[PDB]
From Swiss-Prot:
This is CRISPR system single-strand-specific deoxyribonuclease Cas10/Csm1 (subtype III-A). Ni(2+) and Mn(2+), but not Mg(2+), Ca(2+), Zn(2+), Co(2+), or Cu(2+), is required for ssDNase activity. The N-terminal HD domain has ssDNase activity. The C-terminal GGDEF domain has the cOA synthesis activity. Residues 432-579 form the GGDEF domain. The keyword Nuclease applies. CRISPR (clustered regularly interspaced short palindromic repeat) is an adaptive immune system that provides protection against mobile genetic elements (viruses, transposable elements and conjugative plasmids). CRISPR clusters contain spacers, sequences complementary to antecedent mobile elements, and target invading nucleic acids. CRISPR clusters are transcribed and processed into CRISPR RNA (crRNA). It comes from the Archaea. Probably part of the Csm effector complex, that includes Cas10, Csm2, Csm3, Csm4, Csm5 and mature crRNA. Will form a homodimer in solution, interacts with Csm4, which is a tighter, better association than the homodimeric Cas10 and uses the same interface for interaction. ssDNase activity is inhibited by EDTA. The gene is csm1. Its EC number is 3.1.-.-, 2.7.7.-. Gene3D superfamilies: 3.30.70.270. It comes from Thermococcus onnurineus (strain NA1). The lineage of its organism: Archaea, Methanobacteriati, Methanobacteriota, Thermococci, Thermococcales. GO terms for molecular function: ATP binding; endonuclease activity; exonuclease activity; identical protein binding; transferase activity.
Amino acid sequence: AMMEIDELTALGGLLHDIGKPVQRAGLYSGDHSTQGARFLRDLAENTGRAEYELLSLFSEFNDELMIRRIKELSGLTMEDVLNALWIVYEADNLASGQPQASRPLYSVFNPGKAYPWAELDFEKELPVPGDVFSIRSQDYRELVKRLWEELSKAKLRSDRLLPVLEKYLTFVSSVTSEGNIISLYDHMRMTSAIALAMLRAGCTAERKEKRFLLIEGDFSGIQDFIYRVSGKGTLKYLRARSAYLELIGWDVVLEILSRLGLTRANVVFNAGGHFMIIAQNTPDAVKELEEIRAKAVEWLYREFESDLYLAIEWEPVSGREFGREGGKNLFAEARKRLKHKLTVRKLKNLPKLLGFGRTAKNDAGVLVEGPFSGFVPYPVGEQILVKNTLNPGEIPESAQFVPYFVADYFKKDPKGGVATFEELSMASTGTRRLGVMKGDVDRLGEFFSSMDSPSKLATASRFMDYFFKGYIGAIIEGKFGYIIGDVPSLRDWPEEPDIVVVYAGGDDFFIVGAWDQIFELAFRVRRAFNAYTGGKLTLSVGLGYFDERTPIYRMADVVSERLDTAKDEGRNRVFVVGRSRPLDGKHKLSYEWNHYEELWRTYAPRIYAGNGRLKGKLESKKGLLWKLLEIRELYVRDPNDVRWAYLTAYLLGRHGLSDLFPELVGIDTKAVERKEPQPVYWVDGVLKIVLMAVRR
């Protein structure tokens, strides 16, 4: 039952700073060192063996004091303790290198803003960095109150303590200083990872060497593998090949963790096929890193080939290359080299599924095969990929709890299934067209270069994944209404939204559904993502409204190209709908987020009354709307001509509505001197959406 050296150094570095949150509470006294060991020495007495008694040493720290304190306690042979001791202390400096105590965690997205005291919940708890408000010890006490009962309930192993230290110590600062963006969990996460790594590199206690590895693995034709197959099909399949990539990813990762004997703490992240792990630089490691790779590159060939391929590379880095020396980002510069190898070689469903169980490849009863292992739709056996949760509750036969989050929301088809393309479009408002949204985060890669430590990396990457894989579901189901506020809408948000996510991630998200529920959702995500990142990180989104019975890849290239246009036009934008324009390099197609939302808010209430209805004053005058659009088409052919204003003046008088649209009737030279175009140009993106919401 206990204890190994590749579980003492890990869990030791995993709990080396467990004394901080209890020090920020009212429990013990002295520094976090004393209170942490005092917490673990007491936890050994709490519903369990005398286990954490020895684990308390890592948080307990002089050289006279340490050598005559290990004897009192144990097997290790009084040998594997002193060596595992100094290792942990160095990992912290490698992780990140009178403060306060009530200082809140600040946002990695916005250092000027901090996270208000709220529990971690992907439902009804969207994290919003606000003004700096100090934290009371009473809130830490009731925090530890849960942290006390869960650390005791959960078993003593990495797959058990990692999610508990993550479930509670996420939105708490690691170092109480003004501007600290390093999460507590992420801080003590790599301290386990880096320590375990260097121990494998032969870093027994006695300085800077090449005994450290930094491996990253990712695929290539991911998008061309999901929605560009050309085989019925369809929607259900899009999700299937999406829910397959998640298995292939971990599979390749969980094979690395086993063979090299690592933990999930070494895994910085792993989602949608993109992952990066921290390992050690040894000839043993490389030998099986090449072994795993060589066969990983050989398996997709005999299954998908010629379809998709995997690219895994690793760069030998040094221990000092983890921070800043004289204003030099040694870490990102090392991360830069690693990213180069990838790009270079890149050139060359519905029933009860709570998760997957990693089995032996020869065993049956599975649902699909993998590169190194099979998977059973769910308890068996050792490693089980449990979905969207932090709680295991399974056999204690060394069952490696592997939690994974994924955006897998879908409109539920009757008799318990997944809605199809026609089921999403039939629930549309007005015209019955299918809605397709696609986009990414503006310059997400350059955000990974601003950081300087592995700590900031783990925090920024994890928070990132929390949105598109966690909080995106509560957004789609229609929550966080106060934060998001009023948004462009064709209707009120349904009981169960007609929205299906093929896949969602910061790098790219593909979501389909009812066109009017796709339109509004595009703004709900933005305003949330703006608030989630403090308004520091933005999105680009292309919106398509195609026919129900139309090939997905054909209607994917369009949205992807509409997306490219939004990026090409400067990056924060939304491509609502395709439209005509004058070609002079002055009129853009995509809308700016704040711009379009103001246009909707100002113009839509003039004509639209909600839920497929127009305002009362717009009765028997449906012809006015599109006839005001054709007048705009005149502007399209010649802007510098008041052919649009004169006609958008008396046509209203014929119908007796000379009060509305004061910007389309009058001339606006005031905007001409700004190089910008007329308000009549943009008004179609509001009229057409309303019109297709009231057709038939």
